[PDB]
Amino acid sequence: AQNPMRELRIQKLVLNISVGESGDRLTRAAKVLEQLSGQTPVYSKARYTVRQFGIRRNEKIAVHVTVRGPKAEEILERGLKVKEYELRRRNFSETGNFGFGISEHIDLGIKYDPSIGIYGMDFYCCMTRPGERVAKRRRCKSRIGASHRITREETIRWFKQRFDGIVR
Amino acid sequence: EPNRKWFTNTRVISQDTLQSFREAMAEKQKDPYTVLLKSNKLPMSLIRHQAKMTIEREP
Amino acid sequence: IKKPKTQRYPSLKGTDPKFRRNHRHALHGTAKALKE
């Protein structure tokens, strides 16, 4: 229970901008993600066509990026400043992951370039404990123990203890 | 062979349409000098107890 | 339906040509060995 190998850690933070249309808007959204993260973002195509969404199959409609390490903690804490360290209880998943979404990227500290415009973001934080390599490695891949899996209540407690957040 | 269309209505008609058809057809047989066209393809099937009560009351 | 007769030595006609050629060379060698 109090083992040093049971500490909750941020496995990754995934940043998503789903524009819903291809072209210059998606290019500028990818520029926003590249400027925020420091890495090359990856584009996401539509896997099937919807008529009244205005999208078609094999059309790039979204962009996303994954950050790990202290950079993920920094960007997540900036987003938590934007959300004023207040998340509703439904934002925490049953497996112990969480996430939220901002409506504009200027509040993270990015300057407003008139060429780029206004884009919002989806932040998703995936949490692990040390020992996830058991399920992610190639040779002798196994399953994480039930006592080692993260609980939604443990994630909520970790959030309220580290970030001084108000889960309500 | 089993088929789903054996258990469906094969001919349906609305109340006002049936009433208008019956009225027009009756007006047509009113005149004996008028003959129909393609009568075999027309829905002509739509056009074409005191003792019991007393015995029921008193056997 | 009687069982058909079977030859004492089956032909090398069915076997693979590499082993057939090696077997023919071996038969020539044992023939010269017997002749000696």
Binding site: - | - | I1, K3, P4, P10, G14, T15, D16
Partner: protein, 141 residues
Amino acid sequence: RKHGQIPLSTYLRTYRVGDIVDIKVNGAVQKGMPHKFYHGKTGVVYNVTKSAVGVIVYKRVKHRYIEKRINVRIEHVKPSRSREDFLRRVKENAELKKKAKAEGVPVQLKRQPAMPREAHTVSIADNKPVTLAPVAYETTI
């Protein structure tokens, strides 16, 4: 046979010319598969190739038998236990006859079918017989 992976001791069995093999067709491997007939048939190996063997089968047509030579991969052939009862027996007769000739006493060395049993005595003590009716009395209850 269970779906999925094939056991790998199939490839480690060594077949030679003259060996007796069954044909049990594996559904998973389609290469080297024989006909619909010649499945479940026992034959003689005449040719041994890298991944397949040649099997001599005697098919029947009309009122005669025709020799057929069938090329079957090692997936579908299995060693046949028809002549193990011959090889073990002939070895056993070889050493037993050598030992009996060395010792001097002749023996019966041919296998014999089931003879009638000899006379013996059965004791009644602690095994007293019970009397049975044509129907059980607890059943008639």
